Amino acid sequence: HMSYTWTGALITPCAAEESKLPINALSNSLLRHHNMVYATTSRSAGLRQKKVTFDRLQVLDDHYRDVLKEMKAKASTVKAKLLSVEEACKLTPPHSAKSKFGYGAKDVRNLSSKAVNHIHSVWKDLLEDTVTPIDTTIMAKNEVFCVQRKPARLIVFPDLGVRVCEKMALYDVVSTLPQVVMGSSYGFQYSPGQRVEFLVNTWKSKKNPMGFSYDTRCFDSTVTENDIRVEESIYQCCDLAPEARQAIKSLTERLYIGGPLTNSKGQNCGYRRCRASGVLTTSCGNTLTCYLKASAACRAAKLQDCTMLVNGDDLVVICESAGTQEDAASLRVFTEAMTRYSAPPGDPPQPEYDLELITSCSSNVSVAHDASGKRVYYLTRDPTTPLARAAWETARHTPVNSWLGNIIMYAPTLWARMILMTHFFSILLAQEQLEKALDCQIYGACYSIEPLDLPQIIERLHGLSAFSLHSYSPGEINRVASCLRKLGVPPLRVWRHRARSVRARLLSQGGRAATCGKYLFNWAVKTKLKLTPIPAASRLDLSGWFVAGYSGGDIYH
Ligand SMILES: COc1c(-c2nc3cc(NS(C)(=O)=O)ccc3o2)cc(-c2ccc[nH]c2=O)cc1C(C)(C)C
Numbered sequence: 001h002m003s004y005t006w007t008g009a010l011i012t013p014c015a016a017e018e019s020k021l022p023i024n025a026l027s028n029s030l031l032r033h034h035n036m037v038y039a040t041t042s043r044s045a046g047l048r049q050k051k052v053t054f055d056r057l058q059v060l061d062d063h064y065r066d067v068l069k070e071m072k073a074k075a076s077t078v079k080a081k082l083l084s085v086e087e088a089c090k091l092t093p094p095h096s097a098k099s100k101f102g103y104g105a106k107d108v109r110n111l112s113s114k115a116v117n118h119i120h121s122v123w124k125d126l127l128e129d130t131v132t133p134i135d136t137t138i139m140a141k142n143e144v145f146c147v148q149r150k151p152a153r154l155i156v157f158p159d160l161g162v163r164v165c166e167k168m169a170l171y172d173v174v175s176t177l178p179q180v181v182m183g184s185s186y187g188f189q190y191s192p193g194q195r196v197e198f199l200v201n202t203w204k205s206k207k208n209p210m211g212f213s214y215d216t217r218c219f220d221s222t223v224t225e226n227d228i229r230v231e232e233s234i235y236q237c238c239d240l241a242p243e244a245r246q247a248i249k250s251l252t253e254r255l256y257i258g259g260p261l262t263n264s265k266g267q268n269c270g271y272r273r274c275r276a277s278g279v280l281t282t283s284c285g286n287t288l289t290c291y292l293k294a295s296a297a298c299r300a301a302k303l304q305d306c307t308m309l310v311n312g313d314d315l316v317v318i319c320e321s322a323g324t325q326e327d328a329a330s331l332r333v334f335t336e337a338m339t340r341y342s343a344p345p346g347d348p349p350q351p352e353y354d355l356e357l358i359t360s361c362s363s364n365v366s367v368a369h370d371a372s373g374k375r376v377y378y379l380t381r382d383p384t385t386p387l388a389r390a391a392w393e394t395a396r397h398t399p400v401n402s403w404l405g406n407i408i409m410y411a412p413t414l415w416a417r418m419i420l421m422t423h424f425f426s427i428l429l430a431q432e433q434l435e436k437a438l439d440c441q442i443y444g445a446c447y448s449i450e451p452l453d454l455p456q457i458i459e460r461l462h463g464l465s466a467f468s469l470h471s472y473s474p475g476e477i478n479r480v481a482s483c484l485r486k487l488g489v490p491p492l493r494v495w496r497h498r499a500r501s502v503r504a505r506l507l508s509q510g511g512r513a514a515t516c517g518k519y520l521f522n523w524a525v526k527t528k529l530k531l532t533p534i535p536a537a538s539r540l541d542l543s544g545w546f547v548a549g550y551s552g553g554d555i556y557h
Pocket of ligand 1: 187188191192195282283287311312313314360363379405409441442443444549551
């Protein structure tokens, strides 16, 4: 029952890979300790292969089957539609990996006869054959981090024609089923502001609250054949078109359960018997399985009044405390149950008695004050990885602009406002690229966003207070200041000096640029302008921004 078997063939790159931080004329204005920033490359794929390869044993008890029966009762209320080839084509990212069969992502998006004809033949083969393993490509991800070096994470994905078929069969399922099955526990239905609100209300709902985050070691590799067949039985509870039922059974048998792994040079690398990290069902499958195992583990541990918050492989549990020592024993029982379910831990879970000390989705709740002096809870994170990635993005154009995603998701934070906004608006002004749409990812889905639209996006997700927050916590200020000294980033007083210049330069341009100056940088002036709702914000189609998670799902919105 191994997660993977290997031939010895290498996981090969597609292009030239850079590991050392690229340096340009802008680099030093952001970060001086260049040797601390690195990117992962295929050179470390061999080490990751060793980490992800292990035997999985599963012991399933009555708590497991009880929770599964409850989940299936809710899943039976879902009605899902089959997307047309055209609808599925339009969900494809413009820079999605080209097919092996003579067409790419732009051919798909343009509904080219060749792409559409190949997608129809892949679909027909899914209906007619429910046995043949489907080919997948295995790649090493190129991701940026700060030292203290991680080996490259791996991505496993089927061909472009298969990905369009996955959308046709399961896009509606993976978008609507998780919230129906898990209700308020489904994390991807919330904006960061709604996630904060859910965490605070849950913490308050408990007489003596205790909370913990549970880190499953290499989650995708812990997902067994049973787990993948169980996820399929959940999808099959939906009211579905006969062709969708057949395609879902086919995709589960031929792709989701496992299959051969091919490198970028066409060599057989081995065989996968665990979750594929680059399929449409990665996020939904991970969320459902994590929620199932954790809800059953909570019953086995006799945890009282358990509220879960699940996002793929990320899990937060808030419950009633039995006192510090009993909570510690309780958590070891929870961990034993998770382990029997084939979800052992990385770091052992730690009981927390302060909401602000729980780290989940690399984030924590913190408090600041709005213009009226009222306490405001918001989500923040250690800014090390956002800052290492901003330094890379200062000297290189990348497919996903992490700085833009981070300003969107962490707009109320002291570090996104003072550093990211200041640095990148300065760069965009110098290149007159404020109107240029840039790609970013929100809950794994790809978006093409113009930086000029940031005031309206921030207002809609976080409210006007995101432009007024002040009197940040001593703990939060200390973590930001320590991160700056560690990376060789100029102190906050420098960013404030720079922001006044960036603000003045934006206001000069007028129009949408002046709105960016006015709203994004009001924190930088001593005589603060009165901020009122932006008329353009109501018009924004913020559609399925926070409906579901799509990590590795090849989704463009
Ligand atoms: C929900 O938490 C997130 C997530 C997020 N996506 C996750 C996906 C997984 N697992 S998987 C691969 O199986 O799907 C686990 C934890 C995750 O956290 C992403 C961003 C995020 C941050 C910056 C840019 N784009 C983003 O999507 C921001 C938040 C916050 C701010 C709400 C905490």
